[PDB]
């Protein structure tokens, strides 16, 4: 339905592309989110990020993936209409700064995120920008993967894809070291970083550049060699000058976490893309044995 039936309420923020607004349907009363894309400014027609997001979001149909209601298609601008949830996770972590997010809610969220990602991967979709900002929570304890602008439909087996991929902090070692191929594992890496972030209340690897990002990973998980990552020393962006650091204790890296939690996390952050746990296999992990669905608290 036309833009005439929508009243814009507030500008929420900038996506990987476009601009997100809270809006209200004037006829039904329904609150939606709108993603506005201007086809002016860059006379290249509909951008690829929009093309990829729309087509992939229309296929994907899962309780832990944001629901796309409609696509409104002017010759001036392009609007995507989404279900309105409450808040992105980044904003939720800001609102819960003083108290932190309770461990049962962290468990619940990671579980739902793994379910969404598994569904994504089983449908040949890489997200490639998993981070707190791109995840949406509602008022009843659900979380959903959003912003598929940097997503890609992949082939079996994969070709070389875009190398820019993933916000630095959440970027996997295989991308950083400039491997020919990368795959589903890079999404897993990002979730691991998010998981730790929710627990420690700060980002796990807050690097400033590519090289600083690598060194922060190396310091925490130990510098990779042939035994841990077969063929790491031959990779394009590996250097002989790298500091040979030792892996530090994981109960020191993530203190509030139980033995089950440390086990999962260390598997989500395994150096070898092949040995890194899948989203499917991570759902089986004992860590999620007693998972509940708590509501989020946001006002204290």
């Amino acid at each position: 339905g036309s833009m005439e039936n929508f009243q814009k309420v507030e500008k929420i923020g900038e996506g990987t592309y476009g601009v997100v607004y809270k809006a209200r349907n004037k006829l039904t009363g329904e609150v939606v989110a709108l993603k506005k894309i201007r086809l002016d400014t860059e006379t290249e027609g509909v951008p690829s990020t929009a093309i990829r997001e729309i087509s992939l979001l229309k296929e994907l149909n899962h309780p832990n993936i944001v629901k796309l209601l409609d696509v409104i298609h002017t010759e001036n601008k392009l609007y995507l209409v989404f279900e309105f949830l409450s808040m992105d996770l980044k904003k939720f972590m800001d609102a819960s700064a003083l108290t932190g997010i309770p461990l049962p809610l962290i468990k619940s969220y990671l579980f739902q995120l793994l379910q969404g990602l598994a569904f994504c991967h089983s449908h040949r979709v890489l997200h490639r920008d998993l981070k707190p900002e791109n995840l949406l929570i509602n008022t009843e304890g659900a979380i959903k993967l959003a912003d598929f602008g940097l997503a890609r439909a992949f082939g079996v087996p994969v070709r070389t894809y875009t190398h820019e991929v993933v916000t630095l902090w959440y970027r996997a070692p295989e991308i950083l070291l400039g491997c020919k191929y990368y795959s589903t594992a890079v999404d897993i890496w990002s979730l691991g970083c998010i998981f730790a972030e929710m627990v420690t209340r700060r980002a796990l690897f807050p690097g400033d550049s590519e090289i600083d990002q690598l060194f922060r990973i190396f310091r925490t998980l130990g510098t990779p060699d042939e035994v841990v990552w077969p063929g790491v020393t031959s990779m394009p962006d590996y250097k002989p000058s790298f500091p040979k650091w030792a892996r530090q204790d994981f109960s020191k890296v993530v203190p509030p976490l139980d033995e089950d939690g440390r086990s999962l996390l260390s598997q989500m952050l395994h150096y070898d893309p092949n040995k890194r746990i899948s989203a499917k296999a991570a759902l089986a992990h004992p860590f999620f044995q007693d998972v509940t669905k708590p509501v989020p608290h946001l006002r204290l």
Binding site: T43, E44, G45, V46, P47, S48, I51, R52, I54, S55, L56, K58, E59, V71, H73, E75, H121, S122, H123, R124, A153, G155, V156, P157, R159, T160, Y161, T162, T184, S278, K280, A281
Partner: protein
């Protein structure tokens, strides 16, 4: 090999949904299979001039075939549809797609930048923004994993044959991409090594030599008659050492099946 199984299942489910109307060309008042063959052949050239992935080309044809399943198009506008579909295919699949200006340039000034952009909108509207279609190429690369062992000649020939299927709506429009890929893979495998459709691919796909036969009969014919065909861009393309010069190989006299 953890998602490989359920991805194959999903793609096998999707190829039925992104399937074009079987006899859409009969309902088209002004265009024929011949014109389509010229169009696709020209798209092959574009892909060569701009070094585009095979996947992009296979997607463009799907987009065109689905567009023509619901919209009547006059002959003088068929090249515009192909251009917009190649542009959409590039934005979807390519790391560095060519810019719109480059797509205008290859039409020899027959269409304006404005026209190509408006057509892009129309294709999207008609295809209802569903562009992640299964292709022959996608099923082929999956089948290549079952080579015992990996053979570069067979890979290139299977791609060449799968590609030839795009040119001729009659008959190949009636076969699913997974069937064509199967027939192509077997035909390439028999031609180079003498080996046949592997045991592991019977378990994976549920396709036997008998179930593949119809498509495999047509594809053998297209292969044998390839130097005759009015369209030659694919044959010229696969002359190159990038594809091991597989188009120059002699096809077998019979399949013996």
């Amino acid at each position: 090999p953890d998602y490989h199984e359920d991805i194959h299942t999903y793609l096998r489910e999707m190829e039925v949904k992104c399937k074009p109307k079987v006899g859409y060309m009969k309902k088209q008042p002004d265009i024929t299979n011949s014109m389509r063959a010229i169009l696709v052949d020209w798209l092959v050239e574009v892909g060569e001039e701009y070094k585009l992935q095979n996947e992009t080309l296979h997607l463009a044809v799907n987009y065109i075939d689905r567009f023509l399943s619901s919209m009547s198009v006059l002959r003088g506008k068929l090249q515009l549809v192909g251009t917009a579909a190649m542009l959409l295919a590039s934005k979807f699949e390519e790391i560095y797609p060519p810019e719109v200006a480059e797509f205008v340039y290859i039409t020899d000034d027959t269409y304006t930048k404005k026209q190509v952009l408006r057509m892009e909108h129309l294709v999207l509207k008609v295809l209802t923004f569903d562009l992640a279609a299964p292709t022959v190429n996608q099923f082929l690369t999956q089948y290549f994993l079952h080579q015992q062992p990996a053979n570069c000649k067979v890979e290139s020939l299977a791609m060449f044959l799968g590609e030839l299927s795009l040119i001729d709506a009659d008959p190949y429009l009636k076969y699913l991409p997974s069937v064509i890929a199967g027939a192509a893979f077997h035909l390439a495998l028999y031609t180079v090594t003498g080996q046949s459709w592997p045991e592991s691919l019977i378990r994976k796909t549920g396709y036997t030599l008998e179930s593949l036969k119809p498509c495999l009969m047509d594809l053998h014919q297209t292969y044998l008659k390839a130097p005759q065909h009015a369209q030659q861009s694919i044959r010229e393309k696969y002359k190159n050492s990038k594809y091991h010069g597989v188009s120059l190989l002699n096809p077998p006299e019979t399949l013996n099946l």
